């Protein structure tokens, strides 16, 4: 009746889970599209919209009940499950039903979910350049306590060329990487020297607007997963800093190779929520 996408396996999301650890208690906010609320696998508490004309419960797009979907869809005997069932979900929309915004829409999200209280904030949107306003949000979420997860982009490798962007560019904010299933790195999942971790990330299987359940491919699919993993760390461990959840993260990961393609490796949240 549930499906567990294979990403809960892949990064040992299940064990921690079975630990009796689901994220619970723990705010999330998603900057995206906005999340179709109304869907049964899922529960957004609240947010903020700072796109004109559309509220924040609504996706027009679909990537933001995607994104969501991967970090909380509800543990139950429907749809999909979330890497962290538990937590506080929070729609924070930034991007229209193009899957575009500005950077004041962008770093208005940022600058509510810090004032906010959110602990971990998901950014599965990028850009070529960033801008001192986005840099200076996401050093003081981060200085704040928030764990900040930016996918690192879909360019693929462009050889010596690092195409990992903004916002997961900066040094406050994890950029994150997709692998598929066979725990390999995918074709697009962008390359550079700020290459944090990897997370599933080809073949996602989430939540999607009008009440169904959709497969994507991304680096933004990547990223819910670190997200969801900070927050069972946070859940099982409330007392750590956004910087000892990073460094677990980061630390307790399982090599795959060269960092410049895939950082410190594959992730673990059972051995980083240790
Ligand atoms: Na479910
Ligand atoms: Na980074």
């Given at each position: 009746?549930?499906?567990?996408?294979?990403?809960?396996?892949?990064?040992?999301?299940?064990?921690?889970?079975?630990?009796?650890?689901?994220?619970?208690?723990?705010?999330?906010?998603?900057?995206?599209?906005?999340?179709?609320?109304?869907?049964?696998?899922?529960?957004?508490?609240?947010?903020?919209?700072?796109?004109?004309?559309?509220?924040?419960?609504?996706?027009?797009?679909?990537?933001?009940?995607?994104?969501?979907?991967?970090?909380?869809?509800?543990?139950?005997?429907?749809?999909?499950?979330?890497?962290?069932?538990?937590?506080?979900?929070?729609?924070?929309?930034?991007?229209?039903?193009?899957?575009?915004?500005?950077?004041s829409?962008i770093v208005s999200?940022?600058?509510?979910?810090?004032?906010?209280?959110?602990?971990?904030?998901?950014?599965?949107?990028?850009?070529?350049?960033?801008?001192?306003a986005?840099?200076?949000a996401?050093?003081?979420?981060?200085?704040?306590?928030?764990?900040?997860?930016?996918?690192?982009?879909?360019?693929?490798?462009?050889?010596?060329?690092?195409?990992?962007?903004?916002?997961?560019?900066?040094?406050?904010?994890?950029?994150?990487?997709?692998?598929?299933?066979?725990?390999?790195?995918?074709?697009?999942?962008?390359?550079?020297?700020?290459?944090?971790?990897?997370?599933?990330?080809?073949?996602?299987?989430?939540?999607?607007?009008?009440?169904?359940?959709?497969?994507?491919?991304?680096?933004?699919?990547?990223?819910?997963?670190?997200?969801?993993?900070?927050?069972?760390?946070?859940?099982?461990?409330?007392?750590?800093?956004?910087?000892?959840?990073?460094?677990?993260?980061?630390?307790?990961?399982?090599?795959?190779?060269?960092?410049?393609?895939?950082?410190?490796?594959?992730?673990?949240?059972?051995?980083?929520?240790?």
């Amino acid at each position: 009746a549930q499906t567990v996408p294979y990403g809960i396996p892949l990064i040992k999301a299940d064990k921690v889970q079975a630990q009796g650890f689901k994220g619970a208690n723990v705010k999330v906010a998603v900057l995206d599209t906005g999340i179709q609320a109304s869907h049964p696998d899922l529960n957004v508490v609240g947010g903020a919209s700072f796109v004109a004309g559309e509220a924040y419960n609504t996706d027009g797009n679909g990537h933001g009940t995607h994104v969501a979907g991967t970090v909380a869809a509800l543990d139950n005997t429907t749809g999909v499950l979330g890497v962290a069932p538990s937590v506080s979900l929070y729609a924070v929309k930034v991007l229209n039903s193009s899957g575009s915004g500005s950077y004041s829409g962008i770093v208005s999200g940022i600058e509510w979910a810090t004032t906010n209280g959110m602990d971990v904030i998901n950014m599965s949107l990028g850009g070529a350049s960033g801008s001192t306003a986005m840099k200076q949000a996401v050093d003081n979420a981060y200085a704040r306590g928030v764990v900040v997860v930016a996918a690192a982009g879909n360019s693929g490798n462009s050889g010596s060329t690092n195409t990992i962007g903004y916002p997961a560019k900066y040094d406050s904010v994890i950029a994150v990487g997709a692998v598929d299933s066979n725990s390999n790195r995918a074709s697009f999942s962008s390359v550079g020297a700020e290459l944090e971790v990897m997370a599933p990330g080809a073949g996602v299987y989430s939540t999607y607007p009008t009440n169904t359940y959709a497969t994507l491919n991304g680096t933004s699919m990547a990223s819910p997963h670190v997200a969801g993993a900070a927050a069972l760390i946070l859940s099982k461990h409330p007392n750590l800093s956004a910087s000892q959840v990073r460094n677990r993260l980061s630390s307790t990961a399982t090599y795959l190779g060269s960092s410049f393609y895939y950082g410190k490796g594959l992730i673990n949240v059972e051995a980083a929520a240790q």
